[PDB]
Design an enzyme around this catalytic site. Structure first.
Site, PDB file in Angstrom:
ATOM      1  N   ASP A 250      28.258  31.330  37.523  1.00 16.93           N
ATOM      2  CA  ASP A 250      29.585  30.538  37.502  1.00 16.93           C
ATOM      3  C   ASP A 250      28.999  28.929  37.964  1.00 16.93           C
ATOM      4  O   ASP A 250      29.190  28.978  38.965  1.00 16.93           O
ATOM      5  CB  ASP A 250      30.846  31.169  37.709  1.00 16.93           C
TER       6      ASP A 250
ATOM      7  N   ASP B 174      38.054  24.563  40.209  1.00 17.31           N
ATOM      8  CA  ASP B 174      37.291  26.167  40.997  1.00 17.31           C
ATOM      9  C   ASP B 174      37.636  26.770  42.480  1.00 17.31           C
ATOM     10  O   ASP B 174      38.876  27.108  43.143  1.00 17.31           O
ATOM     11  CB  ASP B 174      36.321  26.352  40.612  1.00 17.31           C
TER      12      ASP B 174
ATOM     13  N   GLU C  87      36.829  35.168  43.117  1.00 16.95           N
ATOM     14  CA  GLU C  87      35.730  34.944  42.681  1.00 16.95           C
ATOM     15  C   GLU C  87      34.718  34.115  43.047  1.00 16.95           C
ATOM     16  O   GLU C  87      33.991  34.037  42.521  1.00 16.95           O
ATOM     17  CB  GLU C  87      37.138  33.940  41.051  1.00 16.95           C
ATOM     18  N   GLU C  88      35.035  33.585  43.270  1.00 11.43           N
ATOM     19  CA  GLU C  88      34.340  32.205  43.903  1.00 11.43           C
ATOM     20  C   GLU C  88      33.399  32.882  45.142  1.00 11.43           C
ATOM     21  O   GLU C  88      32.631  32.271  45.503  1.00 11.43           O
ATOM     22  CB  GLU C  88      34.834  30.487  44.103  1.00 11.43           C
TER      23      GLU C  88
ATOM     24  N   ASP D  87      41.375  35.242  40.731  1.00 11.21           N
ATOM     25  CA  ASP D  87      40.487  34.634  40.270  1.00 11.21           C
ATOM     26  C   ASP D  87      42.181  33.235  40.879  1.00 11.21           C
ATOM     27  O   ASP D  87      42.818  33.127  39.762  1.00 11.21           O
ATOM     28  CB  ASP D  87      41.000  34.447  38.791  1.00 11.21           C
TER      29      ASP D  87
ATOM     30  N   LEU E 115      41.233  30.348  39.385  1.00 12.43           N
ATOM     31  CA  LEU E 115      41.342  29.570  37.871  1.00 12.43           C
ATOM     32  C   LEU E 115      40.880  30.008  37.425  1.00 12.43           C
ATOM     33  O   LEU E 115      39.456  30.345  37.289  1.00 12.43           O
ATOM     34  CB  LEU E 115      40.450  28.107  38.355  1.00 12.43           C
ATOM     35  N   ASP E 116      41.791  30.665  36.301  1.00 17.62           N
ATOM     36  CA  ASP E 116      40.294  30.925  34.891  1.00 17.62           C
ATOM     37  C   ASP E 116      40.704  30.467  33.762  1.00 17.62           C
ATOM     38  O   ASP E 116      41.674  29.611  33.713  1.00 17.62           O
ATOM     39  CB  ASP E 116      41.385  32.281  34.686  1.00 17.62           C
TER      40      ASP E 116
ATOM     41  N   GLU F 155      40.082  39.927  36.741  1.00  8.82           N
ATOM     42  CA  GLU F 155      39.900  39.651  35.943  1.00  8.82           C
ATOM     43  C   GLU F 155      41.280  40.946  34.928  1.00  8.82           C
ATOM     44  O   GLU F 155      42.105  40.761  34.332  1.00  8.82           O
ATOM     45  CB  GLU F 155      39.084  39.055  35.484  1.00  8.82           C
TER      46      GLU F 155
HETATM   47  O1  LIG Z   1      33.196  31.695  25.845  1.00  7.84           O
HETATM   48  P1  LIG Z   1      33.146  33.425  26.106  1.00  7.84           P
HETATM   49  O2  LIG Z   1      31.878  33.731  26.831  1.00  7.84           O
HETATM   50  O3  LIG Z   1      33.778  34.248  25.416  1.00  7.84           O
HETATM   51  O4  LIG Z   1      34.706  33.236  27.358  1.00  7.84           O
HETATM   52  C1  LIG Z   1      35.625  33.166  28.039  1.00  7.84           C
HETATM   53  C2  LIG Z   1      36.070  33.742  28.844  1.00  7.84           C
HETATM   54  O5  LIG Z   1      35.976  33.742  30.145  1.00  7.84           O
HETATM   55  C3  LIG Z   1      36.082  33.337  31.109  1.00  7.84           C
HETATM   56  O6  LIG Z   1      36.207  31.797  31.200  1.00  7.84           O
HETATM   57  C4  LIG Z   1      36.817  34.126  31.860  1.00  7.84           C
HETATM   58  O7  LIG Z   1      35.431  33.574  32.787  1.00  7.84           O
HETATM   59  C5  LIG Z   1      38.167  33.392  30.434  1.00  7.84           C
HETATM   60  O8  LIG Z   1      38.936  32.657  31.004  1.00  7.84           O
HETATM   61  C6  LIG Z   1      37.865  33.189  29.049  1.00  7.84           C
HETATM   62  O9  LIG Z   1      38.611  34.325  27.900  1.00  7.84           O
HETATM   63 MG   LIG Z   2      38.518  33.585  34.938  1.00 10.83          MG
HETATM   64 MG   LIG Z   3      37.933  31.010  38.293  1.00  6.13          MG
HETATM   65 MG   LIG Z   4      33.946  31.017  37.347  1.00  7.14          MG
END
Ligand SMILES: O=P(O)(O)OC[C@H]1O[C@](O)(CO)[C@@H](O)[C@@H]1O
Ligand SMILES: [Mg+2]
Ligand SMILES: [Mg+2]
Ligand SMILES: [Mg+2]
Ligand SMILES: Nc1ncnc2c1ncn2[C@@H]1O[C@H](COP(=O)(O)O)[C@@H](O)[C@H]1O
Ligand SMILES: Nc1ncnc2c1ncn2[C@@H]1O[C@H](COP(=O)(O)O)[C@@H](O)[C@H]1O
Ligand SMILES: Nc1ncnc2c1ncn2[C@@H]1O[C@H](COP(=O)(O)O)[C@@H](O)[C@H]1O
Ligand SMILES: Nc1ncnc2c1ncn2[C@@H]1O[C@H](COP(=O)(O)O)[C@@H](O)[C@H]1O
Ligand SMILES: O=P(O)(O)OC[C@H]1O[C@](O)(CO)[C@@H](O)[C@@H]1O
Ligand SMILES: O=P(O)(O)OC[C@H]1O[C@](O)(CO)[C@@H](O)[C@@H]1O
Ligand SMILES: O=P(O)(O)OC[C@H]1O[C@](O)(CO)[C@@H](O)[C@@H]1O
Ligand SMILES: [Mg+2]
Ligand SMILES: [Mg+2]
Ligand SMILES: [Mg+2]
Ligand SMILES: [Mg+2]
Ligand SMILES: [Mg+2]
Ligand SMILES: [Mg+2]
Ligand SMILES: [Mg+2]
Ligand SMILES: [Mg+2]
Ligand SMILES: [Mg+2]
Lengths: 326, 326, 326, 326
Positions: D59, D65, D88-89, D109, D111-112, D271
């Protein structure tokens, strides 16, 4: 229901004004909001403590003094309405550059109350607006006018709430700041001071230096001749703060000359004059003890003056004592 | 860096405390934030003006008095730490119901400063915390203790900023509220009052009713015997406000008995006692002129008392005058 | 450094504008702040749930729809710049009364995103500004103009932050709201959309009803002919939200006609037109698949239209498929 | 009426809990408020743009983040309730130092939503709480447990409003943040997901890589076999955001394995697991297509997993297709 912005704009219509004066008043408020916000958290942002230099009037200056001086100069500059600025903190006059230049002259105390900053007591901002009569280039002189030429004046109080007090030829209105949506909301329209009041505000530590008129007057407040109950006493130490209580409560406020200060301590351009204007437009009076403050022709942008104001029956009483001793 | 919540929790550890006292202090702060917020916009929410009833001490009560009384009772109830409440505004004692009952006794002035509400001058909240020694059921008596039994005390100041002043056996710390994230941030740790100061705070309108000790003392402040410069004068009209300036500036604050008020005007449980505790824990002194305030055994939850506090060299000077006239 | 208010005023100078258009833009922002604030707490203020009436386009309307419709009408009325309003929620046109009347015509979706209100997904406000060419009295007709006559257009996004997107003849600038001082601060100046992007935004639930051009295009996005990686997919369900991501990411957004909706679902005056203007002023394209959206002459204030926009290499690709099937 | 803090404390009573778990939940919220606030103004504080390092899962990490990772680690450390953190980080596990050590294990996480940060779409925070069963020293292993051992789980959504979703053995409750007093207020108690819904959420750009079960299912959503109207489609791109809409609307959310990602993309500890817990405690279901997600025993703190959740009639339908192709 009514915001400042609605009010001012409408007033401006009624006045047929071109719009300069109205952008000017809006630039100012925004400045006030900026300050209120810094102020309500100064300690967290570590704005208490001094900056460094002393100032023309010998004032120790501190970080808030500066931060708010700047917001303001800068917001007035960019208003495009003002050609000459006058600051408590500024040695000589600020002449606005042409490209942004306008036809208004604004004098101001970016932050009144220095004593009470560290102890978190009420603080405020004072301002006066004059209109440039003259046709020469915009020099400093243009800010040497008697208060009676003020087209607008007022103060911001950062007390238990933030409030804007504005006064123009029509009268006086009070607006409060909604911290929540960041807009000033009018709460009092066309206010008037009581004819006579219950409170005398003065620093009595100077008891030694007062003249015989003030001395007698104070005595008369503490031992009424007619047996009425005696007046109560308040001095906060912030003019904006004391003057405001006086507008809405009635009574009288005092920083007269003393043995060691023949002209008193408050500054005529950016403290004395605005307050006396407000006071008079509210049905108040504002004298040195010998003359009305608004009628004094200033000869130094930074000069000092005695100031006595408030309810007119109250002010009158002192003037008569003053004449008595004449 | 440090929040209140961190601080209190840690203190609680150092003290091995079970946790009751800590939820209690957290419930209180939240109450303070609730009030600060109402207060900074009262006019917009139209909280100025009276509610209706007069009160046991004959106080005209107004909407803010109530709104903040309620938040507080309610937040203390739900703290689950307190068994007996005492309110400025409440005629008899509030006995908490068992299900929520705890072992702390809290006396409080939900809103000190009534005079200055309408004119937007600083206002505050005062509180004291005692621990229930007794084993009978939780009656009113349990809130009749001398201040020396206070386990914690302080006040909130809604001045140009909101601040929490808390004092416990260790010492005094000041926290400020970040309006932005709604948390109190510690700004001063383990504060101490100056040994001697420059300011005398008292309502001089009572000049007529003062005794000869206070009279002489004031005189001595205005005409120093030794030629030093004379003391300056401040009285805001809000105890919390005057007391606070005194803690951080030094000096002295005064609401002594008078000809017509043999026991002075401030209320011992929820005004006098907390402030004297703070003052002493900061290295201050707090007397009636004849006895230390903390050492008075209360016999009425609503009784009044003379109060003189601040820098100890300053307080001492008056006590000696008091004895002189003995 | 730069606020909206500075920016707009300065632009206004550069344009020599009289000032009407500038008070107008300021009235609008204030409206946006008002909404952002209601919105960030709707649930606490219990603004979720419906009001009652259905609407001309058959939209179930709910309390936020109304609350924000009103702030806006009202703030535009009092701007003194507008003579004719058009609301999603308003059956016929609002003709401003003379005393407040001006020379601007503003169409608007007080609240776009109805689906996502209850689930707290991003919502926004859309607006367009036309200038009244005509000399008859201000009837409804005056709001039937092709988008190319727009003098200003944009939207507010209440996403993880509140943002104002404004576009005029010069170009597009993005401002963000400082929740703290309640002013919009410019963060992006003179933005431009990428020439080609990675994302296709469309509701695929309509797969059944799409025409053969859209069908083929989607297929081409999922199985690139040239083996490049396949496009990613996003549809939030709020136009303002999807359109915004598209401006700053590149890509393409789609609500084309379907078997059961020959003219698509979005509303041309107050949804379709502003967005296409923005898009084009940013270097975007915006078609129905057969014609540019801005070039359509409206015959009903409430009519619907297909809308395909975004990066021009992306939009082009679809147009060619559209012609292919011609 | 009810704050989070009241609620949690009371729950804690009902549970007889000692208090550790409750300080823990309070430390967390505070962290959430801290983030909401940074987030609502990131651009003004210039928090958009990357920090530097890539991360264990590859990532790209950016300033938000980090800023939110830190607040959180730090606020959990100082909670005094947690002995093992998972970020996550963070490459390896954070073992809390003894002096602050407790008996809870929190995966998170900070920040998701990374995709949607720059385009201001909804973002959130995810967390899970496990209780340390073991008696060895607090190593990393202790955070390798199947979700069924979660004692508490939830997420913060920074959408058009900030909301805290918390779920424990009892059920699920939603609280909203009052930006104004900085406290979370409960708005929905004991929520339950609809048994069957109208929306399918999945990234269709992967159409190429889906297996035959997902492919068939999507087809079945777009061309109902029974002629019912077809399902609508939403994918925001933020799990927290999509999952939330699904809780309160019903329907189903999908990030299943693909040809090139045998185990899907979402991360199981911080997650996948929290969300499935919430979903089940609300009356939802949460599978990989072959097994329930909560029942998977983790062997890497950073491992990935397929995730399909939402209304149980909806989830079931897919499982049957999955078995079909078995
Ligand atoms: O763009 P993609 O491959 O569909 O993944 C999006 C997903 O990844 C995330 O950023 C988590 O890493 C989620 O918030 C989101 O549902
Ligand atoms: Mg996330
Ligand atoms: Mg995150
Ligand atoms: Mg990340
Ligand atoms: N907003 C306003 N409020 C009150 N008076 C105004 C306003 N705008 C203009 N005026 C009057 O018109 C004069 C000139 O303003 P201006 O049109 O900016 O030069 C001022 O001295 C005011 O007395
Ligand atoms: N948070 C705290 N701060 C200071 N002292 C505390 C704290 N918690 C407990 N104590 C001490 O322990 C005593 C009883 O608190 P409790 O454990 O709640 O009964 C109090 O009188 C305090 O002196
Ligand atoms: N603040 C402004 N920003 C951009 N253009 C403006 C502004 N004010 C005036 N103009 C230009 O001048 C025209 C008329 O504005 P007004 O002077 O209010 O009638 C508008 O169509 C604008 O193109
Ligand atoms: N505030 C609370 N809310 C819900 N459950 C709690 C709470 N406090 C304690 N418990 C229950 O008691 C257990 C241990 O908490 P603690 O007493 O901190 O060890 C937890 O697993 C909870 O199930
Ligand atoms: O302490 P002094 O000498 O009474 O002066 C206090 C005055 O000085 C000021 O700080 C202005 O300089 C006023 O706000 C206040 O009224
Ligand atoms: O106006 P007085 O009689 O001096 O009393 C003012 C005092 O009364 C109080 O309002 C408390 O009742 C204090 O805040 C203040 O110090
Ligand atoms: O759910 P649908 O039919 O795809 O339409 C969603 C669209 O409708 C709107 O709510 C406008 O009415 C848009 O914000 C959104 O793009
Ligand atoms: Mg100074
Ligand atoms: Mg000053
Ligand atoms: Mg001053
Ligand atoms: Mg009272
Ligand atoms: Mg009170
Ligand atoms: Mg009081
Ligand atoms: Mg609608
Ligand atoms: Mg709408
Ligand atoms: Mg819409």
């Amino acid at each position: 229901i009514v915001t400042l912005t609605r009010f001012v704009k409408e007033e401006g219509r009624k006045a047929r004004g071109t719009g300069e004066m109205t952008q000017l008043l809006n630039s100012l408020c925004t400045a006030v909001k900026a300050i209120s916000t810094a102020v309500r958290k100064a300690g967290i942002a570590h704005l208490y403590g001094i900056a460094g230099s002393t100032n023309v009037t010998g004032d120790q200056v501190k970080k808030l003094d500066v931060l708010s001086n700047d917001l303001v100069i800068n917001v007035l500059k960019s208003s495009f309405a003002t050609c000459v600025l006058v600051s408590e903190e500024d040695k000589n006059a600020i002449i606005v550059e042409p490209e942004k230049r306008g036809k208004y002259v604004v004098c101001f105390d970016p932050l009144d109350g220095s004593s009470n900053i560290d102890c978190l007591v009420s603080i405020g901002t004072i301002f006066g607006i004059y209109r440039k009569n003259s046709t020469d280039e915009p020099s400093e002189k243009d800010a040497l006018q008697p208060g009676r030429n003020l087209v607008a004046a007022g103060y911001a109080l950062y007390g238990s709430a933030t409030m804007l007090v504005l006064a123009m030829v029509n009268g006086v209105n009070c607006f409060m700041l909604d911290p929540a949506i960041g807009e000033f909301i009018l709460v009092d329209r066309d206010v008037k001071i009581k004819k006579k009041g219950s409170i005398y505000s003065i620093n009595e530590g100077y008891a030694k230096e007062f003249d015989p008129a003030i001395t007698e007057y104070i005595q008369r407040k503490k031992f009424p001749p007619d047996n009425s109950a005696p007046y109560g006493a308040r001095y906060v130490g912030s003019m904006v703060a004391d003057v405001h209580r006086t507008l809405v409560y009635g009574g009288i406020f005092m920083y007269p000359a003393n043995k060691k200060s023949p002209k008193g301590k408050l500054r005529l351009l950016y403290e004395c004059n605005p307050m006396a204007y407000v006071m008079e437009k509210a049905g108040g009076l504002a004298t040195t003890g010998k003359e009305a403050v608004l009628d004094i022709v200033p000869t130094d942008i930074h000069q000092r003056a005695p100031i006595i104001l408030g309810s007119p029956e109250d002010v009158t009483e002192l003037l008569e004592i003053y004449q008595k001793h004449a």
